[PDB]
Amino acid sequence: NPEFFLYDIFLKFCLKYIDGEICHDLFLLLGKYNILPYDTSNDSIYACTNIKHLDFINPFGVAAGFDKNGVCIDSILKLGFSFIEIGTITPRGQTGNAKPRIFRDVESRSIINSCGFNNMGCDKVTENLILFRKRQEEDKLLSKHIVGVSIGKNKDTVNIVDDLKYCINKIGRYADYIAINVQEAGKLKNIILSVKEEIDNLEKNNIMNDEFLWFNTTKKKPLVFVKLAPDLNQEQKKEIADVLLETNIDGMIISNTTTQINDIKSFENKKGGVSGAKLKDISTKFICEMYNYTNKQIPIIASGGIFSGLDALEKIEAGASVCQLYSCLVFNGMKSAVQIKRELNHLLYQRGYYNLKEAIGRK
Numbered sequence: 001n002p003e004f005f006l007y008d009i010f011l012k013f014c015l016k017y018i019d020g021e022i023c024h025d026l027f028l029l030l031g032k033y034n035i036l037p038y039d040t041s042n043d044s045i046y047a048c049t050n051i052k053h054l055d056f057i058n059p060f061g062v063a064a065g066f067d068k069n070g071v072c073i074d075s076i077l078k079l080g081f082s083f084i085e086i087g088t089i090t091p092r093g094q095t096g097n098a099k100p101r102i103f104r105d106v107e108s109r110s111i112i113n114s115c116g117f118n119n120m121g122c123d124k125v126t127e128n129l130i131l132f133r134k135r136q137e138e139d140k141l142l143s144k145h146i147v148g149v150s151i152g153k154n155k156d157t158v159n160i161v162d163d164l165k166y167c168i169n170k171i172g173r174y175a176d177y178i179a180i181n182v183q184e185a186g187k188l189k190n191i192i193l194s195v196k197e198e199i200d201n202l203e204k205n206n207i208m209n210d211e212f213l214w215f216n217t218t219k220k221k222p223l224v225f226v227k228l229a230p231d232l233n234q235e236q237k238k239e240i241a242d243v244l245l246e247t248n249i250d251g252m253i254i255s256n257t258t259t260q261i262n263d264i265k266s267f268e269n270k271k272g273g274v275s276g277a278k279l280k281d282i283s284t285k286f287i288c289e290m291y292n293y294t295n296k297q298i299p300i301i302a303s304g305g306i307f308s309g310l311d312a313l314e315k316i317e318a319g320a321s322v323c324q325l326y327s328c329l330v331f332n333g334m335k336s337a338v339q340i341k342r343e344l345n346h347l348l349y350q351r352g353y354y355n356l357k358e359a360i361g362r363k
């Protein structure tokens with residue numbers, strides 16, 4: 001379509017000449033003004049998926065760090081994504097590290113960043129999410145679309161559990177799921193359990209029925225996911241895997257950015273974590289490991305170097321039930337969701353899968 005094509009041209013221009021974070025904020029602004037294209041197509045009923053009772057109309061969403069402050073949830077979802085993870089948010093606002101703090105490498109389709117958890121803080125973002133939830137009631141294209149919220153600690157926190165607790169008390173009512181982003185097995189167990197308790201306490205301390213308590217999509221309490229970084233050793237992964245089973249966690253997001261990459265020349269003297277195509281193989285391997293160490297009792301959300309339908313099926317066959325995009329949107333533009341959904345549908349057919357669910361963990 002011409003709407004997608006025109007923006008993809010503008011994107012490639014922007015990619016060549018303009019600073020990354022400036023580009024990002026610009027396009028976010030365009031989304032806020034609601035002048036980005038829509039994908040109004042019906043998603044294949046065979047590519048639908050779920051994390052327990054949380055149902056996704058298709059297997060592609062947008063990862064955390066893209067719309068940190070939830071300023072244009074509508075427009076991003078309407079590009080064809082089934083869900084978005086806003087945040088990571090913190091209890092108080094943070095400016096993050098010094099700019100410029102994000103850099104791309106087009107030929108390797110990789111990104112490096114050291115943002116330092118810049119965000120408007122839980123109060124403001126909660127206000128933004130509420131406004132979205134009200135629009136969602138009115139907007140036909142937002143029905144059954146999921147919004148998760150990634151929460152983290154402040155830069156100089158007094159207590160991590162209390163930081164996450166503050167966020168949950170503020171924004172939990174409006175979230176379909178919560179992503180814990182922070183890592184010793186002992187500390188993690190405490191963190192995970194406190195989060196579950198505080199979510200359960202929202203149900204308790206309210207006199208309203210669920211239909212009027214959970215102002216979200218599921219009309220139930222938010223699930224609890226945890227997001228893991230790829231830079232762990234095997235003993236660390238096994239220990240974590242146990243805690244996630246002990247705590248009965250609803251899902252795990254595999255994975256965040258890596259520091260193990262150094263063969264990107266333009267990133268030679270650059271500081272931060274890498275994402276994009278170079279993270280793909282590392283991330284896929286991580287999924288297989290945690291899918292095994294866990295005995296497949298914890299659903300997985302895939303993240304890392306997913307650009308194509310082919311890339312998607314790898315993550316799924318490794319154990320993932322859903323996929324998150326970020327770098328793809330930077331390098332492929334507005335068509336990312338429309339394209340990847342089409343490719344995965346073709347692939348699931350040619351490979352002789354009846355539906356997507358059948359392909360999870362096959363390899």
Ligand SMILES: Cc1cc2nc3c(=O)[nH]c(=O)nc-3n(C[C@H](O)[C@H](O)[C@H](O)COP(=O)(O)O)c2cc1C
Binds near residue numbers: 064088115150257324
């Ligand atoms: C600029 C930037 C900001 C990010 N911010 C967050 C964040 O706030 N919270 C989080 O969990 N992950 C964050 N991430 C990691 C992404 O959510 C994602 O896990 C990672 O980029 C791998 O996906 P990709 O290879 O498709 O880009 C960020 C990544 C980038 C590049």
Ligand SMILES: Cc1cc(N[C@H]2CCc3ccc(Br)cc3C2)n2nc(C(C)(F)F)nc2n1
Binds near residue numbers: 015020072111
């Ligand atoms: C040219 C261009 C663009 C870009 N993001 C865009 C992607 C496409 C898109 C679509 C809808 C909405 Br709403 C928002 C955005 C943000 N980025 N992001 C970075 C980085 C590495 F994060 F800095 N560089 C970029 N360069």
Ligand SMILES: CCCCCCCCCCCC[N+](C)(C)[O-]
Binds near residue numbers: 003010034036038
């Ligand atoms: C030279 C500028 C290139 C961008 C093209 C701008 C026109 C796009 C119009 C999209 C319509 C938005 N929508 C779907 C909400 O109507």
Ligand SMILES: O=C(O)c1cc(=O)[nH]c(=O)[nH]1
Binds near residue numbers: 117118
């Ligand atoms: O905000 C950031 O700097 C950030 C957070 C995160 O979780 N992952 C990442 O790569 N960057």
